[PDB]
Write the structure tokens for this entry.
Amino acid sequence: NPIEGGVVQVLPYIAVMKDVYHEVSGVKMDNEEVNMVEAYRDPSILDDE
Amino acid sequence: NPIEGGVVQVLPYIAVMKDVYHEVSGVKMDNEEVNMVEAYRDPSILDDE
Amino acid sequence: YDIVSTNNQLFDGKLVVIPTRAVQQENDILSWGQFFYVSTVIADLPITRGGHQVTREIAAIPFNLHVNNIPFALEFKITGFQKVMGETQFNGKLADLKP
Amino acid sequence: NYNEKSQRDFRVVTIGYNLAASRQDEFAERIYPTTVI
Amino acid sequence: NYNEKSQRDFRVVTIGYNLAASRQDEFAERIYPTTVI
Amino acid sequence: FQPDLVGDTRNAVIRFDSDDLVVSGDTTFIDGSADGVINDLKTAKLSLRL
Amino acid sequence: VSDAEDKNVNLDVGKELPEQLKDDEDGKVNPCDEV
Amino acid sequence: TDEGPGEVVKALTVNTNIRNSNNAVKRMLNYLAQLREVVHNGYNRPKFGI
């Protein structure tokens, strides 16, 4: 529609997060975050020991 | 409502602009713009010769 | 025989041939391996991890084992698909013989 | 204004996202059939 | 997202803006009563 | 561009924020040269994420 | 500690998508209509 | 939140189910690797414990 003037694409997903704490002096958080979809090709992202 | 968590205040108005051309080396558009509501206290903003 | 495929990153460029029983039963030793599965439980408790904050942690705790029965297997490492389907394989040779 | 062009409100489309998995994949099931313990 | 506290949707209030004037405001109408020519 | 939600409704704002900006030994400068940092990146087999 | 229904699991994250993201920001005004 | 987790708990079971498939592959490949060793060496007859 001429009033809408474009589209916005909203992408929900489930993120696999590494369980880490915030670093006192950290520049950015080191929590690896990946799409669950990645696990279908590379499911090793889900394993932990 | 908790889903809103705040408000937005929209203030439409009609502005009185001067007829001003754009400069080739200007840092801003030098067009004195005033809300017409100001004319009630000081109508001289509307004077044009 | 039958063909079963995966896209696991680990199982990349591998063909393995293994026997199985034509008709599968229950805990049949003649299946190449067993997957022994115990029901997975979802645990929900507001654990105060760290001693200073409370979070509701919902955990899925698996309990299972994969067991192999039959030692028979054939393993084939199959590579070079792009070399035989890409580069010329017969007339290339005749050029190579050119003195 | 002289021109609005309507640059605030756009059409929004939601991308589907539907994860699925069986107890184990058909690949795993054919090789390691499931037995409940 | 651990805490989905609202950030984008708000209660939007659009206020009025009604400007009005007579051909001459009363202060000036009483001093200079209008005569149509 | 994104709309500016606070202020004049006609303000449009851009917020470009990229942590994957790439420099490697393969790229060149605007003048066409590939020397200094780029040459050392190519020799050391390195790449940068700016 | 309930048992999971793992046999066949089908997720739908779109149903859980917050209502905020189902539409755009609603502050939009046509100043010419309001004045 | 008193609404409960909703339908995202299933994501925990999907994660678990995917890991189950990966465990089958990991165990299969490890079994074949040590199978190679057993058959490569002098174990061409049935025996317990090999």
Notes: The first helix of chain G runs from residue 13 to 16.
